[PDB]
Symmetry: C2
Subunit: 476 residues, 2 copies
């Protein structure tokens, strides 16, 4: 059983109060490393969620809005709370997620970064008066809080994800009802424990936990929740669009991906291998930003694969708390099985094994396979595991089409020394994020979001700041 | 039957060509003023709508975009084309909608200003490099065309609506497939006739017409139509959301509204009265920007009704082709019956008839006289529903807080208006009003220079101003190492 100064209150949080009405109802939180229960978390009822919304609604202030300077201070204080607690918050993340302790701490730093960007740029929501005076009026445009919002996040980034949402929601003056994945609630609870000591207005942030059905239902149907920001499965997200259609709710969605990582025959192979590894095994591959389809030009395919094998073979798998562990365990059995299945499917269909073990011999080790085509499962769906499937290509036009050969359009990466070709590939890829000779993911300073089925809206950057506002135009 | 040089091609417009596969399949357009059929338009099949998309897809240039000056010239040419053919489009508009010729022409002017505004501000979509350099990279943000869009518009503004959508979509480099209401296809045809002579790329604009089911279904299902921009009924809007959820399509939605027009006891009454009459009766009240609930402070209610009845009685209803007509017929029997039913309902429940006729006296036409009822409360249909007709329902109120809750007492949040000599109070009202548009001592509607759209169930996204320019683009972040 886990114990932490950040978790002395193992319960919900409503209107400035740690509380719940589960009546002892509980759900288990496992450590994927030990296969053991590390905490029993209150499984909260419908009524707690409704209580949460009433509290948020009561912190919402339109006629007498919290001032810009007051909000900026919450933002700074949160940035500072995360940084101060990185080690312990990161510890809890490692234990419920699997992710190595060091990487987990870094995610906390990353989270801090989003609060920092919103604090410095919160003025971007300042209302403005256009210079033109049509129909003999003066026209002023305001950005109103959208209202109480539900922030829903997956286990993929137990702390980084909510940071992207909460930072922009607070900047806009929106109270929020927050729901974490039942796989990684503890990092949430810890996070609230830190905020609990920062003098946020009662009901500005609220925490509900438990059965997805119970929480999701209230949040979808409630008339005082004009907006949902959801990150998670495309399946669940599509059900959200349907279930919020009558009220025509405002949605921010970041869903599944199928990131093509493209390496040209004129690529800097060493940089590309280095970037690939950094990109791919972050979170044991369990990311929507992680490369999923590696396209390598025939002329350098063999040398590239060997470069990844040299790198991949020096990596270690195991318990992430221990030191010197590069990748931890996958989140659960269902996730492990899908990765094993993709491995089998590729080999059975005749891909070759460049690095890693045979599925029969299988914690999932870093694995590289070569000779992948559109017929393999791992090409058609996202692996969410430490698997590197290499596909071949020769032409620019071919690889762009193959790149775009998917429902999705979240992240992608292109490596080439021809700057003009790199630029065309970026324009041609129907993805919200394109790495140009880098495999680096989204940053708080810039928009991240998907085209096609990968989502709606952008988080991070200028546009991220506008997620939780409604433009209101006022002629005088 | 209607004859015009702008209507020498009464058919669709795909890939530069006037064509269709209707095989003779027709639908009728009526002049709401005469009850006569004025045109028979081809009822285009699935395959025509799919062709429209293929054409558009073929004009989509991701990797070798149409240069920003080229796109700028299109907008400029279109803006000039509208202004030039402003009287003949106004004519066709008048006859199919019912709106008076003047008003119609003015709508063409209004449409032109969206194109103008987008030409002046097209530079807003330029990619930009941020000053920060996290993770050793230089970060550039691009705004790519979303891809081929479907532009779907209602009959309320046969030229104004489409103008909002197409000006932004061209500025973006988005080829579009365009679907007007079957009640008002001719203004659309006229518009395409005007654009057809402007050297646009084959496939940049495309026109489809016919059965809503048919057209709508292709646009929802097709994988090359990443985005839909729809103005129309909240009902159909809800259906679009559901029918495009699987692909998670990007949608812009401008749907129904229930606009509260609020008048304080310290308000300049003559100005509010003036404003009310101009806002309410435009398009014969058949607009989502038209006041639907008029909240008046008890201390000025009586004087206010007088002022309104005074102006209403001077107004004139008739065929809009004739000079001196302030308001023309309503669009159809369904619309007429609704305005009638809200009038009946109000009087059945106690409302007083300050101006206009008792429902049983209403003519055999679609002509509905400007009417004013007093004594209206939340129990009444016209308060609960949007009336879309020349009806002015007056509800009383006392306090600021009471009237703000009253204004928000609706599914929607499109437009709203407040009159008050108190400027600090006026600002608290705008703030508390969950509406995308709030008139401050004015009743004017949306403008190309500023964002317009709904909070709540009135829609998703904004047209006009800056944010409108960003509707038809996908932002793309490109860090470079």
């Amino acid at each position: 059983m886990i114990e932490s100064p950040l978790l002395e209150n193992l319960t919900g949080y409503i209107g400035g109060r740690w509380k719940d009405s589960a009546g002892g109802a509980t759900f288990d939180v496992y450590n994927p490393a030990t296969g053991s229960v590390i905490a029993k978390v209150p499984s909260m009822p419908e009524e707690d969620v409704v209580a949460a919304v009433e509290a948020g609604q009561s912190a919402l202030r339109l006629t007498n809005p919290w001032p810009i300077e007051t909000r900026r201070k919450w933002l700074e204080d949160i940035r500072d709370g995360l940084k101060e607690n990185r080690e312990e918050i990161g510890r809890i993340l490692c234990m419920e997620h699997g992710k190595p302790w060091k990487e987990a701490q870094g995610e906390v730093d990353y989270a801090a970064g989003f609060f920092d960007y919103c604090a410095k740029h919160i003025s971007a929501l300042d209302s403005h008066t256009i210079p033109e005076k049509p129909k003999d009026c003066t026209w002023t445009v305001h950005y109103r809080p959208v209202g109480v919002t539900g922030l829903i996040v997956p286990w993929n980034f137990p702390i980084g994800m909510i940071a992207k949402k909460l930072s922009a929601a607070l900047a806009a003056g929106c109270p929020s009802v927050i729901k974490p994945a039942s796989e990684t609630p503890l990092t949430m609870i810890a996070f609230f424990s830190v905020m609990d000591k920062l003098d946020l207005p009662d009901g500005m942030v609220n925490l509900v936990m438990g059965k997805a059905s119970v929480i999701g239902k209230v949040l979808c149907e409630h008339k005082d929740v004009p907006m949902l920001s959801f990150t998670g499965s495309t399946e669940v997200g599509r059900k959200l669009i349907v279930d919020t259609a009558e009220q025509v709710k405002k949605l921010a969605l970041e869903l599944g991906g199928n990131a093509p990582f493209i390496v040209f025959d004129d690529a800097d192979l060493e940089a590309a291998a280095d970037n690939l590894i950094a990109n791919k095994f972050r979170g044991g591959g369990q990311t929507c930003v992680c490369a999923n389809r590696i396209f390598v030009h025939e002329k350098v395919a063999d040398a590239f694969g060997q470069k990844l094998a040299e790198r991949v073979n020096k990596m270690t798998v195991g318990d992430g708390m221990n030191d010197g562990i590069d990748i931890g365990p996958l989140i659960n059995k269902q996730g492990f099985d899908k990765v094993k299945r993709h491995l089998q499917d590729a080999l059975d269909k005749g891909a070759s094994l460049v690095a890693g073990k045979q599925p029969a011999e299988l914690f999932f080790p870093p694995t590289v396979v070569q000779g992948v085509d559109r017929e393999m499962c791992c090409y058609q769906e996202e692996t969410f595991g430490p698997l590197v499937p290499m596909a071949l290509f020769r032409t620019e036009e071919e690889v762009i089409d193959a790149g775009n050969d998917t429902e999705f359009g979240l992240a992608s990466y292109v490596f080439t020394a021809d700057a003009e070709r790199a630029q065309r590939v970026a324009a041609g890829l129907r993805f919200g994020h394109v790495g140009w000779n880098t495999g680096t993911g989204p940053t708080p300073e810039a928009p991240f979001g998907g085209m096609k089925a990968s989502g709606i809206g952008r988080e991070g950057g200028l546009e991220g700041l506008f997620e939780f506002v409604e433009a209101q135009t006022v002629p005088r």
